[PDB]
Amino acid sequence: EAEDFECSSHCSELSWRQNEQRRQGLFCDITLCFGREFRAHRSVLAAATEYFTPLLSGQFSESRSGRVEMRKWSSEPGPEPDTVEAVIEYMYTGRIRVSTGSVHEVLELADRFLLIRLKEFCGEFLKKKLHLSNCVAIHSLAHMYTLSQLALKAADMIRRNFHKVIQDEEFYTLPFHLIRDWLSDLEITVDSEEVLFETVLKWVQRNAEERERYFEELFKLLRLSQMKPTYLTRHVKPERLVANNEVCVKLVADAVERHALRAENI
């Protein structure tokens, strides 16, 4: 007869022992540059994610170089060295501690290096830590790093407290494409449609020379019909940003004519 054996510790032992080899720079065949260089094993990295397989295949320059230069990160001198060390140790051990302050870089490293399970954990970590204080920041990460379940939950929170979100400075940090999407959204709760115009003017004023070009497209997204005709003539029309653009002048002109034609229809 034949018997099957399974070493109970072999799985945990192999991972920890290869990680201790890496920390000692023993049997390392690849260098990861983010600056601080991280020596690692090609066999472990290629096993951790599908990303390292073509990088260390031989069909590209990096296999003949022995060193890989990881560039164009959210921060100028790359991510935090301790965070990169945690993500590299994760690729070996499968164990990682993620904090509220490191989650954005762990998610950036996990998403870029196609670490699906680590990206899922970051998404689940931000889901449990989701609140009105960090809803704008969490939505930006979920939209950026494709966390559809988290993006829906964070967006559904902003749509309800949009009147409070547009009051804080955090909303005015958002790039044009996100500002354009929130104005296009119909389920957002606002006390008045006139407040939406006042927030567009406040957003463009934050970076005048860099956000004046976006005012024309954002004004076209505004619901001029829902706003009162008194505010459209005394506050909307005399603005400097609306007076410059000829199409923005015709937009408020057609809006005033639309209010007069609708009032006579009754």
Binding site: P54, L55, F60, V68, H104, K129, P175
Partner: protein, 359 residues
């Protein structure tokens, strides 16, 4: 606390990234993959998808692959129609597979983030669809590949020596282009193959029935079944074994069932009269493959056994021995040739229960 730094990517910067990737894809298609940095090409494709420009990268990828396969690959295959067609098509097929692996590797982030989100085909499957539609199923190539593969199988059956490997590579290609399916292989190859095979086996049966005995014919059907299975194992796809064997069975057995069993001085009755045990076993084994096969054998045997039994009950101890000798003879045939089949046992019993009740 939780931080986020989303940035707007300038339209001119997206175009420069795409121009770099477009050039890289074109260099991979030209087999000049050496000197290309994977990380920088992955990062460029990553930055495009990350900044929500995945549609431009996907549309662009579809354009560059289509431009290459129509303007370069289709022409190479079209210029080789009468000069090494299968060799040039398989070379174009291997060059496409090699290129698409590297292209899917560079656009790996798009393959896991964009194609999943926007319910569109992945880089490799898109490459297969473009190769399938613009090369393999174009028209002049589709008809010539169908003409080439069928002419080779038609020649091999006539005694000619053909490149079986070239057929296997073409069939493997048609299967993969089915996108984890046999739609392309079935439509382009299998359907006309079964059509031309049925026409060949129909004419094969006509010749064999006109000059060979029932025993030799049965041996020749078994030989044809084996020749067509061996052909599927070395040239075609494994899924063609059942449809080809069914066509062999339809054209050589099913359509000539009453003809084979009632063959004058060689059929079932002749085998029954001369006690040809082995031949009847071979007839049983061959006819058990097709529906109404054993039924035809039973009906032929029943007609003869009843005729013999009626003649036995009509024509003291010698009369009783005659029925016992007839019973012992057919009991031997049932065990030694008809594998003690329930249908044959019921027929032998049923016939005996008819003529023994008659007198």
């Amino acid at each position: 606390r939780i931080r986020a730094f989303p940035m707007t990517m300038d339209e001119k910067y997206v175009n420069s990234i795409w121009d770099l990737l477009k050039n890289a894809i074109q260099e991979i298609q030209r087999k000049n993959n050496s000197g290309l940095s994977f990380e920088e090409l992955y990062r460029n494709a990553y930055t495009m998808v990350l900044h929500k420009h995945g549609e431009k990268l996907y549309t662009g990828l579809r354009e560059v692959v289509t431009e290459h396969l129509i303007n370069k690959v289709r022409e190479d295959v079209l210029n080789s129609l009468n000069n090494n067609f299968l060799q040039t098509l398989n070379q174009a097929w291997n060059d496409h597979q090699t290129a698409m692996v590297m292209i899917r590797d560079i656009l790996m982030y798009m393959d896991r983030v964009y194609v999943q989100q926007n319910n569109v085909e992945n880089v490799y499957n898109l490459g297969l669809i473009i190769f399938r539609d613009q090369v393999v199923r174009y028209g002049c190539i589709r008809d010539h590949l169908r003409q080439t593969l069928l002419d080779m199988i038609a020649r091999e059956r006539k005694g000619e020596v053909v490149d079986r490997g070239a057929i296997r590579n073409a069939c493997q290609m048609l299967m993969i282009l089915g996108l984890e399916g046999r739609s392309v292989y079935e439509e382009d190859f299998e359907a006309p193959f079964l059509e031309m095979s049925a026409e060949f086996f129909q004419m094969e049966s006509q010749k064999f029935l006109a000059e060979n005995s029932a025993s030799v014919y049965i041996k020749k059907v078994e030989a044809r079944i084996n020749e067509e299975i061996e052909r599927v194992m070395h040239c075609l796809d494994k899924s063609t074994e059942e449809p080809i064997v069914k066509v062999v069975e339809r054209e050589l057995i099913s359509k000539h069932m009453k003809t084979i069993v009632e063959m004058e001085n060689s059929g079932l009755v002749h085998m029954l009269k001369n006690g040809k045990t082995e031949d009847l076993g071979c007839m049983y084994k061959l006819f058990s493959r097709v529906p109404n096969g054993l039924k035809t054998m039973c009906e032929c045997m029943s007609s003869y056994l009843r005729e013999q039994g009626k003649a036995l009950v009509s024509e003291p101890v010698d009369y009783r021995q005659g029925l016992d000798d007839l019973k012992s003879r057919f009991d031997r045939f049932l065990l030694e040739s008809f594998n003690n089949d329930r249908l044959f046992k019921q027929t032998i019993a049923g016939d005996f229960e008819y003529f023994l009740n008659l007198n």
